[PDB]
Amino acid sequence: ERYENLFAQLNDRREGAFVPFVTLGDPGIEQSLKIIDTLIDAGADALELGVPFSDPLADGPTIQNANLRAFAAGVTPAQCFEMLALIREKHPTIPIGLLMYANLVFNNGIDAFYARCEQVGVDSVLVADVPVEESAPFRQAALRHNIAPIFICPPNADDDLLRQVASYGRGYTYLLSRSGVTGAENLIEKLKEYHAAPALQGFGISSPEQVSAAVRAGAAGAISGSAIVKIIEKNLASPKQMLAELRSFVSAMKAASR
Amino acid sequence: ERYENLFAQLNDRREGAFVPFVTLGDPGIEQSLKIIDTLIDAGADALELGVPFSDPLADGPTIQNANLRAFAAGVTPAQCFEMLALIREKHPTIPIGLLMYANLVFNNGIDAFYARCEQVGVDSVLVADVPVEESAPFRQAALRHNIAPIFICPPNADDDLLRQVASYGRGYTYLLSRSGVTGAENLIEKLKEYHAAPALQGFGISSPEQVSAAVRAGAAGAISGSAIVKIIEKNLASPKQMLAELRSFVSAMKAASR
Amino acid sequence: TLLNPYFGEFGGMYVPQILMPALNQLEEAFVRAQKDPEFQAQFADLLKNYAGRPTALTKCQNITAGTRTTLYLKREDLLHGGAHKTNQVLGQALLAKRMGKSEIIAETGAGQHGVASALASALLGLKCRIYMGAKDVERQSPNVFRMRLMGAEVIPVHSGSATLKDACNEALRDWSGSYETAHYMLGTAAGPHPYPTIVREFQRMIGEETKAQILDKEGRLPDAVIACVGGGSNAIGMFADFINDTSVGLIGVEPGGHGIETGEHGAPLKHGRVGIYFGMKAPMMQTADGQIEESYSISAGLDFPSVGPQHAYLNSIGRADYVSITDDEALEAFKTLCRHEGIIPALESSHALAHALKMMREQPEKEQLLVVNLSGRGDKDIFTVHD
Amino acid sequence: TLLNPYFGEFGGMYVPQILMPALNQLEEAFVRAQKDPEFQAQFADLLKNYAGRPTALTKCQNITAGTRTTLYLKREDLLHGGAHKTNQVLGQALLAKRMGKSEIIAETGAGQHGVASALASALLGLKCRIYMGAKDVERQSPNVFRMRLMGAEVIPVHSGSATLKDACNEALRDWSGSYETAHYMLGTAAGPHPYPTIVREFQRMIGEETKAQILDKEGRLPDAVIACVGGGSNAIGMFADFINDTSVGLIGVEPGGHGIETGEHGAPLKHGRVGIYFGMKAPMMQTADGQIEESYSISAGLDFPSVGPQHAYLNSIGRADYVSITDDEALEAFKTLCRHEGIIPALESSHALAHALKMMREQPEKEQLLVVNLSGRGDKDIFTVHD
Ligand SMILES: O=P(O)(O)OCCCc1c[nH]c2ccc(F)cc12
Ligand SMILES: O=P(O)(O)OCCCc1c[nH]c2ccc(F)cc12
Ligand code: NA
Ligand code: NA
């Protein structure tokens, strides 16, 4: 519903959505909250949050480092849900999607994980290592708790995959810009035909021009993570320059979205 | 002939023979000559000389060290024959036997080695690693050059070996006191019955009492090497004490021979 | 999929969507290959004329004196390469070519699977890059040189804990973008389907030879076949042909490390919790939070933080039993085999031996015909066992 | 003696008289054993079920591409122990027991014969002491630990040059006083009769398997069989069964070290003078004075300062040819086999490989069926070849 409204206002006002991604707790709980508030303040249409996992097999170095940075801060899944509740409390309307790894949601029990998401006010959950063929238990728990089960549509997607992700997903469909893993250093048609949730393009998006291209291609917006996390990385010793730089990138990216 | 006479005088005067053994060139050419003159002066009835070989498989540590000491002095086979000629020049009657290793006599040609022995005035040659079954070429060359081919009679000698060594040997028969190798730290009947050259007992003889035992057992004398070489070893830094000690041991040993 | 990716509730294909087509193509290739006589012939030929199959089945002479235990050792330590790992990499390499793949990706903990991949790669003309925990690379220079010597690119991983699990991740990441021309040569009977099935099928000649060999030498099936279990390839390779022979006990031995109660072990099957990682649903070493942990053991090759799905399943239905052996027990079995049989066993296989010794010593009057899978030779462990 | 101790003018028994009864008893035991079916069965069984015979005959696939040379490798590197040395120590150990001997004496240069003696000793219940040049012990810690690990007493020799030859001497000295209960397990086809004959007979299964294997795979005998020659055991083991097949060339390769003209080599057969040492009449490395010298080579296992009598004899009558391979050539053949066939060869065997590569490269259009005897695996040489 939160995603629905976001896409209503967006398209209605002929605008593309810009969704930044960052790891919760990176580089520290307090700094993380500030970072997110700055993202939103700077023009973020939605948030894609990752919870520190020990073996992020779908992430490139940039993100891997973020997780390590997070772990270094003592951040845990329980602490992530706390930040999530606090974030939702300050921003009632912004859509919040979770980038998870299967074991973190399977740990305490699949249903229980989605119940906690619902309780905290999370809108969607994309489980990186759970393909459509192994998603049954995950989407059912999501639906049961009003959580949007996010699915990935890769470049090598055949028609069969296309129909499944269009029929199982909600909120938005994650359009993989390419193969490989997350790294800033790197279908829309059929999806629409099949009534798939608005597509958001991800992986390698770092150029404000890429956003216009995405929305131009027919995507409803774009997700950018490594690009954002790098800014955090470089200005790691100057919290102030971190937010300033963060603010400028997003505005440029968001700007290029309309 | 030299051995013959020695045994004539000896037995005639009811006396046992004492034969010291040392390595030529140990610890140095000049010291060696002095050592030998002292041995003779001290009462040695005959001499058993060894020429430095690289792989003395029949010798224990004491002698092995002597050879190493010799090699350290730059002593060679050619230099040994020089000392031999010089020694014979000072002592015309004393019998001189050579303790050799097969390769040293085979090197320049077997016959040639015995010709050189004859030329230098050597009386006998015992080749440590040449058993009676492989001695043909060695005794023939010896006979041809008037050199006494010395053979070893071990404890495990059967009647067959006994008849061969009695029939092939000359000068004296080397009676092995035991098995193993040369080390101070350690049949006469049948031999006589077969007309074997006077037997000399060797290996482990270091006690003046052992000499009386040997001659008492029916042996014509005893050879002692490690015992003598040790004296050289210990007094290596005091040439004077070396000769003094050397002199005393031999006199005691010789004394115990009558 | 053509084959069932689950063993009871264990198994599956929990990998990013992008990699599913690759897995499906791999399963297709495997299924056809299995029915391809030219493929079987080629595989067999390599196993026999190049690897050294069939390996011997040695009856221990001194080790069991004074007891009623008859111990036999399946000699995989006599396989070209020094371990059982060679069997399957040969088959996977042929499969790669069957699929037209030109490069090979592999992960290795102790280095044995790395070396095996490099050698099969060099022989079959495939470019080969190996991922190794930066930590392991430094503790396994020998196997490293061996790998390079054979022309393989050994890439150390510093991400995470820089150990096996972190190497497994880099392999999948790499494969994620290269499944195109590269093939992922997984080292054990774990990971996403069809690897657990492919690896077992390419290691099953172990149990088949053993069965034929013991029937020949003893006229009856053993009472039990024992094997160490790091990830499960050697164990399942030995078990496979005996599963339907219910009279035959199957015993898997996980590393007990400093001891279970100590927490420092590598026995997830019996002391871990089911989780989802490395593309599969299976028991593993993880925190209460769901974070993945490392397995500990004196032997580097038994450090896979999880276990193969078919083992977790064989256990649940009670067909196979799993036990653990501590560092010291394995060390003692290592010394005992050297001194009494003149065979230096890998520290990994020592765990299997140690248990067989326990079964024998504990009930010396018990008449039993045991077969231990000597997965490898311990030349590699000479120094460690030296200190 | 029952058998002729000479090969033409080479051979004999040049040992102190005290040791002749021991040699004569050894020859007697051997002769009867050879006619004893229970002995053959026992030996065969150990070779097959414990050592791993028969070893494979691997056709090289990539190494010879572009030439008309077909190269096969006799895989003795796949023998339990890592080298061909295992074959004969098993037989000598059985012989010892046949004679009622309870202890075993052995000499070792690189350590391979030491390890092989220790393992056969441990297996057959014999006390075992190994003599090793104090110099070698220090350069071969791995093989040393292995030996001790297996319960053998490794005695380093500091006498002389403290190398192989000095170890061989201590063994004879020791045996001189202990032939009583101890047996001297000589490591190569040299020394006093009947060792050159016994060792060849206990290593002859190599050529017999090769002949049967190539006839099977190629339908014809090879054009030549090549083998490195340190002392001659592996070479004669391979040659034996082919001697009467005059169409088959026998090529022995001695280490050329830094090069013949350099003086720093280990090729006495072709560049040494006949002498008498180690109980035999044969060519050797000696000064003009008749002092015995050491053989030099990048590979420690080819440093025996002499050669086996039957090789010096086969050469003189023109039945076999002997060549030399330099350090660098052997090193290049080592790297080439690793990278193209995924087999790490012993630096010793590399000399044989190097020559086969030379025959091929020099006349690439020449059609030839060559068989190289891969006497051992090079795990032991990994570090040295590393530097
Ligand atoms: O800008 P980039 O390329 O870092 O994209 C990040 C996209 C969000 C993102 C972060 N981690 C992931 C793991 C799996 C996945 F499917 C998506 C993501
Ligand atoms: O005192 P002892 O034990 O060192 O004996 C020395 C006897 C003379 C001797 C010296 N080296 C030898 C090598 C072989 C051999 F038959 C005798 C000797
Ligand atoms: Na494990
Ligand atoms: Na030699």
mmCIF file with all atom_site columns, N, CA, C and O in Angstrom, chain D residues 117-137:
data_model
loop_
_atom_site.group_PDB
_atom_site.id
_atom_site.type_symbol
_atom_site.label_atom_id
_atom_site.label_alt_id
_atom_site.label_comp_id
_atom_site.label_asym_id
_atom_site.label_entity_id
_atom_site.label_seq_id
_atom_site.pdbx_PDB_ins_code
_atom_site.Cartn_x
_atom_site.Cartn_y
_atom_site.Cartn_z
_atom_site.occupancy
_atom_site.B_iso_or_equiv
_atom_site.pdbx_formal_charge
_atom_site.auth_seq_id
_atom_site.auth_comp_id
_atom_site.auth_asym_id
_atom_site.auth_atom_id
_atom_site.pdbx_PDB_model_num
ATOM 1  N N  . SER D 1 117 ? 61.810 -48.514 3.843  1.00 0.00 ? 117 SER D N  1
ATOM 2  C CA . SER D 1 117 ? 62.274 -49.556 4.753  1.00 0.00 ? 117 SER D CA 1
ATOM 3  C C  . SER D 1 117 ? 61.506 -49.468 6.060  1.00 0.00 ? 117 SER D C  1
ATOM 4  O O  . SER D 1 117 ? 61.107 -50.478 6.624  1.00 0.00 ? 117 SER D O  1
ATOM 5  N N  . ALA D 1 118 ? 61.310 -48.248 6.540  1.00 0.00 ? 118 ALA D N  1
ATOM 6  C CA . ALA D 1 118 ? 60.579 -48.029 7.775  1.00 0.00 ? 118 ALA D CA 1
ATOM 7  C C  . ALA D 1 118 ? 59.149 -48.551 7.639  1.00 0.00 ? 118 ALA D C  1
ATOM 8  O O  . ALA D 1 118 ? 58.661 -49.257 8.515  1.00 0.00 ? 118 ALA D O  1
ATOM 9  N N  . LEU D 1 119 ? 58.482 -48.220 6.537  1.00 0.00 ? 119 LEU D N  1
ATOM 10 C CA . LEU D 1 119 ? 57.112 -48.669 6.357  1.00 0.00 ? 119 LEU D CA 1
ATOM 11 C C  . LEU D 1 119 ? 56.988 -50.184 6.248  1.00 0.00 ? 119 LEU D C  1
ATOM 12 O O  . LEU D 1 119 ? 56.069 -50.775 6.813  1.00 0.00 ? 119 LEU D O  1
ATOM 13 N N  . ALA D 1 120 ? 57.908 -50.832 5.540  1.00 0.00 ? 120 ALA D N  1
ATOM 14 C CA . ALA D 1 120 ? 57.833 -52.286 5.415  1.00 0.00 ? 120 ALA D CA 1
ATOM 15 C C  . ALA D 1 120 ? 58.197 -52.929 6.749  1.00 0.00 ? 120 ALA D C  1
ATOM 16 O O  . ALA D 1 120 ? 57.723 -54.016 7.085  1.00 0.00 ? 120 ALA D O  1
ATOM 17 N N  . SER D 1 121 ? 59.037 -52.241 7.508  1.00 0.00 ? 121 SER D N  1
ATOM 18 C CA . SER D 1 121 ? 59.493 -52.742 8.803  1.00 0.00 ? 121 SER D CA 1
ATOM 19 C C  . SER D 1 121 ? 58.351 -52.707 9.800  1.00 0.00 ? 121 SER D C  1
ATOM 20 O O  . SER D 1 121 ? 58.112 -53.677 10.522 1.00 0.00 ? 121 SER D O  1
ATOM 21 N N  . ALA D 1 122 ? 57.659 -51.570 9.827  1.00 0.00 ? 122 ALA D N  1
ATOM 22 C CA . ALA D 1 122 ? 56.522 -51.358 10.715 1.00 0.00 ? 122 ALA D CA 1
ATOM 23 C C  . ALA D 1 122 ? 55.432 -52.377 10.414 1.00 0.00 ? 122 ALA D C  1
ATOM 24 O O  . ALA D 1 122 ? 54.841 -52.957 11.317 1.00 0.00 ? 122 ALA D O  1
ATOM 25 N N  . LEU D 1 123 ? 55.183 -52.599 9.132  1.00 0.00 ? 123 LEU D N  1
ATOM 26 C CA . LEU D 1 123 ? 54.157 -53.531 8.714  1.00 0.00 ? 123 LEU D CA 1
ATOM 27 C C  . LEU D 1 123 ? 54.472 -54.971 9.047  1.00 0.00 ? 123 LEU D C  1
ATOM 28 O O  . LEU D 1 123 ? 53.592 -55.720 9.479  1.00 0.00 ? 123 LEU D O  1
ATOM 29 N N  . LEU D 1 124 ? 55.726 -55.365 8.847  1.00 0.00 ? 124 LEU D N  1
ATOM 30 C CA . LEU D 1 124 ? 56.120 -56.748 9.069  1.00 0.00 ? 124 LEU D CA 1
ATOM 31 C C  . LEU D 1 124 ? 56.726 -57.063 10.422 1.00 0.00 ? 124 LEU D C  1
ATOM 32 O O  . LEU D 1 124 ? 57.199 -58.172 10.652 1.00 0.00 ? 124 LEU D O  1
ATOM 33 N N  . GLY D 1 125 ? 56.707 -56.089 11.317 1.00 0.00 ? 125 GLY D N  1
ATOM 34 C CA . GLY D 1 125 ? 57.232 -56.311 12.648 1.00 0.00 ? 125 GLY D CA 1
ATOM 35 C C  . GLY D 1 125 ? 58.715 -56.583 12.727 1.00 0.00 ? 125 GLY D C  1
ATOM 36 O O  . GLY D 1 125 ? 59.141 -57.630 13.216 1.00 0.00 ? 125 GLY D O  1
ATOM 37 N N  . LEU D 1 126 ? 59.507 -55.637 12.243 1.00 0.00 ? 126 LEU D N  1
ATOM 38 C CA . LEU D 1 126 ? 60.954 -55.765 12.278 1.00 0.00 ? 126 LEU D CA 1
ATOM 39 C C  . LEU D 1 126 ? 61.469 -54.477 12.880 1.00 0.00 ? 126 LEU D C  1
ATOM 40 O O  . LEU D 1 126 ? 60.900 -53.413 12.639 1.00 0.00 ? 126 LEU D O  1
ATOM 41 N N  . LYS D 1 127 ? 62.516 -54.556 13.690 1.00 0.00 ? 127 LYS D N  1
ATOM 42 C CA . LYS D 1 127 ? 63.082 -53.342 14.271 1.00 0.00 ? 127 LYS D CA 1
ATOM 43 C C  . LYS D 1 127 ? 63.887 -52.758 13.121 1.00 0.00 ? 127 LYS D C  1
ATOM 44 O O  . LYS D 1 127 ? 64.522 -53.494 12.375 1.00 0.00 ? 127 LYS D O  1
ATOM 45 N N  . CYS D 1 128 ? 63.872 -51.444 12.968 1.00 0.00 ? 128 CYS D N  1
ATOM 46 C CA . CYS D 1 128 ? 64.563 -50.850 11.841 1.00 0.00 ? 128 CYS D CA 1
ATOM 47 C C  . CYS D 1 128 ? 65.378 -49.603 12.164 1.00 0.00 ? 128 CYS D C  1
ATOM 48 O O  . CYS D 1 128 ? 64.865 -48.640 12.739 1.00 0.00 ? 128 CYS D O  1
ATOM 49 N N  . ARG D 1 129 ? 66.661 -49.642 11.801 1.00 0.00 ? 129 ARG D N  1
ATOM 50 C CA . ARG D 1 129 ? 67.561 -48.506 11.991 1.00 0.00 ? 129 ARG D CA 1
ATOM 51 C C  . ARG D 1 129 ? 68.097 -48.098 10.619 1.00 0.00 ? 129 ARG D C  1
ATOM 52 O O  . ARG D 1 129 ? 68.550 -48.935 9.836  1.00 0.00 ? 129 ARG D O  1
ATOM 53 N N  . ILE D 1 130 ? 68.025 -46.802 10.343 1.00 0.00 ? 130 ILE D N  1
ATOM 54 C CA . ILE D 1 130 ? 68.446 -46.240 9.073  1.00 0.00 ? 130 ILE D CA 1
ATOM 55 C C  . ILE D 1 130 ? 69.663 -45.334 9.190  1.00 0.00 ? 130 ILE D C  1
ATOM 56 O O  . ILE D 1 130 ? 69.723 -44.466 10.059 1.00 0.00 ? 130 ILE D O  1
ATOM 57 N N  . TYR D 1 131 ? 70.633 -45.535 8.305  1.00 0.00 ? 131 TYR D N  1
ATOM 58 C CA . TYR D 1 131 ? 71.824 -44.699 8.309  1.00 0.00 ? 131 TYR D CA 1
ATOM 59 C C  . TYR D 1 131 ? 71.642 -43.657 7.219  1.00 0.00 ? 131 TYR D C  1
ATOM 60 O O  . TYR D 1 131 ? 71.269 -43.977 6.086  1.00 0.00 ? 131 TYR D O  1
ATOM 61 N N  . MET D 1 132 ? 71.884 -42.406 7.582  1.00 0.00 ? 132 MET D N  1
ATOM 62 C CA . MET D 1 132 ? 71.723 -41.296 6.663  1.00 0.00 ? 132 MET D CA 1
ATOM 63 C C  . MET D 1 132 ? 72.854 -40.307 6.852  1.00 0.00 ? 132 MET D C  1
ATOM 64 O O  . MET D 1 132 ? 73.231 -39.988 7.981  1.00 0.00 ? 132 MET D O  1
ATOM 65 N N  . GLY D 1 133 ? 73.399 -39.829 5.740  1.00 0.00 ? 133 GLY D N  1
ATOM 66 C CA . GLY D 1 133 ? 74.476 -38.871 5.819  1.00 0.00 ? 133 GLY D CA 1
ATOM 67 C C  . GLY D 1 133 ? 73.983 -37.695 6.627  1.00 0.00 ? 133 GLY D C  1
ATOM 68 O O  . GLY D 1 133 ? 72.983 -37.069 6.271  1.00 0.00 ? 133 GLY D O  1
ATOM 69 N N  . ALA D 1 134 ? 74.678 -37.402 7.722  1.00 0.00 ? 134 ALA D N  1
ATOM 70 C CA . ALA D 1 134 ? 74.307 -36.295 8.592  1.00 0.00 ? 134 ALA D CA 1
ATOM 71 C C  . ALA D 1 134 ? 73.898 -35.063 7.784  1.00 0.00 ? 134 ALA D C  1
ATOM 72 O O  . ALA D 1 134 ? 73.039 -34.291 8.208  1.00 0.00 ? 134 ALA D O  1
ATOM 73 N N  . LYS D 1 135 ? 74.515 -34.888 6.620  1.00 0.00 ? 135 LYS D N  1
ATOM 74 C CA . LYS D 1 135 ? 74.214 -33.760 5.744  1.00 0.00 ? 135 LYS D CA 1
ATOM 75 C C  . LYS D 1 135 ? 72.806 -33.907 5.188  1.00 0.00 ? 135 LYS D C  1
ATOM 76 O O  . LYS D 1 135 ? 72.018 -32.967 5.218  1.00 0.00 ? 135 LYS D O  1
ATOM 77 N N  . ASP D 1 136 ? 72.504 -35.099 4.683  1.00 0.00 ? 136 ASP D N  1
ATOM 78 C CA . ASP D 1 136 ? 71.199 -35.399 4.098  1.00 0.00 ? 136 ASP D CA 1
ATOM 79 C C  . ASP D 1 136 ? 70.047 -35.297 5.090  1.00 0.00 ? 136 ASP D C  1
ATOM 80 O O  . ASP D 1 136 ? 68.974 -34.784 4.766  1.00 0.00 ? 136 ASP D O  1
ATOM 81 N N  . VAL D 1 137 ? 70.271 -35.809 6.295  1.00 0.00 ? 137 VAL D N  1
ATOM 82 C CA . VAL D 1 137 ? 69.266 -35.777 7.342  1.00 0.00 ? 137 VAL D CA 1
ATOM 83 C C  . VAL D 1 137 ? 68.750 -34.352 7.486  1.00 0.00 ? 137 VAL D C  1
ATOM 84 O O  . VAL D 1 137 ? 67.545 -34.114 7.547  1.00 0.00 ? 137 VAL D O  1
#
